């Protein structure tokens with residue numbers, strides 16, 4: 001792509017191809033800011049009746065997603081036009097946006113939904129979904145316009161466009177028990193469990209309340225919808241933060257959930273509940289072509305292996321998108337799109353079963369990461385992250401590669417490579433933690449590059465980073481750091497075919513003193529065909545001050 005191959009096209013409002021009579025924001029990297037939090041670090045602000053931004057379709061579309069920001073505690077509309085003719089109204093709302101913290105309490109980002117004395121609003125953008133009753137061809141002018149009766153003001157960030165097929169019917173009424181106006185999901189599953197000729201259930205087009213955790217047991221179960229734009233599982237929207245969705249018991253290993261959407265009612269992060277799918281230790285489960293929003297996570301695996309997450313959309317969650325932990329191995333996380341996760345979009349945390357091994361995170365897109373990294377790998381062995389697109393992180397790297405234990409029982413990285421192969425990282429990095437007494441100090445935070453290679457308290461070894469383009473990172477392209485006093489010697493750390501374009505500070509930073517009591521990196525790394533282009537200060541910082549770290553310039557480096 002790079003990244004996921006999805007049927008929708010993403011178009012930035014602020015593109016120079018888009019006529020507007022509104023206000024185009026100058027980009028910055030600030031959390032809590034309408035530019036800093038936008039895709040592309042810019043939006044078009046519509047602030048008077050008649051103000052518009054005009055998109056042009058590059059593929060046919062009958063359906064649209066408008067990422068936008070409106071005032072706190074408001075709902076309303078903004079208008080959509082096709083070739084100058086009004087065609088409908090988006091339902092725009094800040095119900096799920098505006099999470100409050102302060103610049104020194106970003107650890108609270110996502111947790112606190114109420115405004116208050118001295119609190120700043122973060123996580124300002126949210127989405128509106130709209131289907132029109134015609135497929136408009138490529139080249140159609142799709143205008144977003146603020147008409148009389150629409151909201152008082154709106155920041156227009158991007159538009160998704162999609163040509164959605166008609167809804168798919170029950171594949172076989174004699175094998176899939178249909179949910180209906182008078183037969184609930186639980187009742188259909190009971191009928192399925194008690195009749196061995198059934199393969200599962202079918203959930204038709206419509207809105208279907210999920211006010212409970214729905215348990216899958218008995219045997220492997222198929223749950224099939226009509227398509228994610230059509231079958232909508234809806235948490236009770238007059239409630240907040242209810243733990244609903246599916247929980248897959250061991251008897252239902254081998255199950256499949258596909259072709260539907262799930263619309264949670266979380267308005268802030270809660271740690272414990274809130275994963276749309278629970279399945280601790282689950283095996284051979286397939287989750288395919290589902291679209292999930294407003295949960296804490298899609299899935300948090302614990303010794304969960306041989307599972308497949310494919311073709312999914314994970315948007316506007318309050319923590320991680322998918323995390324696989326504590327022995328989770330041989331999983332296929334392929335061709336998924338995440339935007340607006342509230343913690344790491346796609347993550348792998350290896351812990352004791354020795355390591356998480358054999359996982360393949362492929363063809364993944366993670367953008368507008370509202371906290372933490374787009375992609376996070378903590379230890380493990382023989383795990384592949386391939387064909388990635390990451391962009392617009394609020395507080396942390398595009399990719400974190402870390403051997404810090406967080407107090408859990410883990411061995412760090414193992415004896416087979418953890419591979420990042422093929423990645424584009426646009427405007428990644430950010431500020432987090434504190435930097436009291438730090439070297440190379442520019443603000444009150446620690447400062448994170450597009451890729452952070454962090455040796456923690458466990459072994460840091462066998463890391464291969466290749467075929468990566470890092471464009472306009474907030475601060476640095478590659479950032480290497482060793483936790484003191486552990487000073488774990490980094491071994492077999494190799495970087496190949498990497499372009500680092502326009503980093504504001506350095507192409508490569510070897511962290512010398514992250515904060516009081518911390519020192520420089522231990523071990524070394526090899527660089528082949530690594531280009532640093534137009535760094536703000538210099539190509540590499542820290543080399544002379546890191547006497548325990550050897551930079552090996554194999555060939556092809558311009559620094």
Ligand SMILES: OC[C@H]1O[C@H](O[C@@H]2[C@@H](O)[C@@H](O)O[C@H](CO)[C@H]2O)[C@H](O)[C@@H](O)[C@@H]1O
Nearest residue numbers: 269270271272274296297300319320325
């Ligand atoms: O393995 C560590 C814990 O993971 C889970 O809880 C996570 C919590 O520690 C924090 O990281 O937030 C995320 C998102 O809300 C939580 O999923 C497990 O629920 C917990 O039992 C583990 O100890």
Ligand SMILES: OC[C@H]1O[C@H](O[C@@H]2[C@@H](O)[C@@H](O)O[C@H](CO)[C@H]2O)[C@H](O)[C@@H](O)[C@@H]1O
Nearest residue numbers: 404406433434446454456481514515518
């Ligand atoms: O030491 C306890 C904390 O460790 C980790 O965070 C570290 C942070 O405290 C600061 O020192 O910076 C380093 C990175 O340079 C961080 O790794 C954990 O992330 C945090 O949860 C612990 O409280």
Ligand SMILES: OC[C@H]1O[C@H](O[C@@H]2[C@@H](O)[C@H](O)O[C@H](CO)[C@H]2O)[C@H](O)[C@@H](O)[C@@H]1O
Nearest residue numbers: 091092093095096128129130207232237
């Ligand atoms: O009050 C529930 C819900 O309403 C709005 O979303 C609509 C959604 O409920 C329905 O399923 O689809 C519509 C068209 O896509 C949505 O506009 C609000 O936008 C949402 O905040 C709210 O929870």
Ligand SMILES: [Ca+2]
Nearest residue numbers: 039040042157
């Ligand atoms: Ca934008």
